[PDB]
Design a protein around this ligand. Structure first.
Ligand code: CL
Ligand code: CL
Ligand code: CL
Ligand code: CL
Ligand code: NA
Length: 129
């Protein structure tokens, strides 16, 4: 599924991500924009052999199981395929764990490089939320 901007904002709010760990909804929408361009089916292989999955490009190195990432963990206790669903619940649940791990949203390199410090409220501007 490819979400619209406000549509994704609403879905994230519905699943309790707005101001989770102090990160406003615009931060989460911005991260999703630059991680996946709002596409739930996005997958990208990393140089180390792990793969990133879904709207928030969650890595099989630590967070989900894809059966082909040696030495990795599965801390969200989910198959990585679950992070590709049209329903964003599994991605949201796992993102909540990731952002609680110590470094906040810096865990998402695209958030640090493209969202952090910017006018992230622009991402929810005009949205009926
Ligand atoms: Cl957009
Ligand atoms: Cl915001
Ligand atoms: Cl594996
Ligand atoms: Cl980046
Ligand atoms: Na894994």
């Amino acid at each position: 599924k490819v979400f619209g901007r406000c549509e994704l904002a609403a879905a994230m709010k519905r699943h309790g991500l707005d101001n989770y760990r102090g990160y406003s909804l615009g931060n989460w929408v911005c991260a999703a924009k630059f991680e996946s361009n709002f596409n739930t089916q996005a997958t990208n292989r990393n140089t180390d052999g792990s793969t990133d999955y879904g709207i928030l490009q969650i890595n099989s190195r630590w967070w989900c199981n894809d059966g082909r990432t040696p030495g990795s963990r599965n801390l969200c206790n989910i198959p990585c395929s679950a992070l590709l669903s049209s329903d964003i619940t599994a991605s949201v649940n796992c993102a909540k764990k990731i952002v609680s791990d110590g470094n906040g949203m810096n865990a998402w390199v695209a958030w640090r490089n493209r969202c952090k410090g910017t006018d992230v409220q622009a991402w929810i501007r005009g949205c009926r939320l």
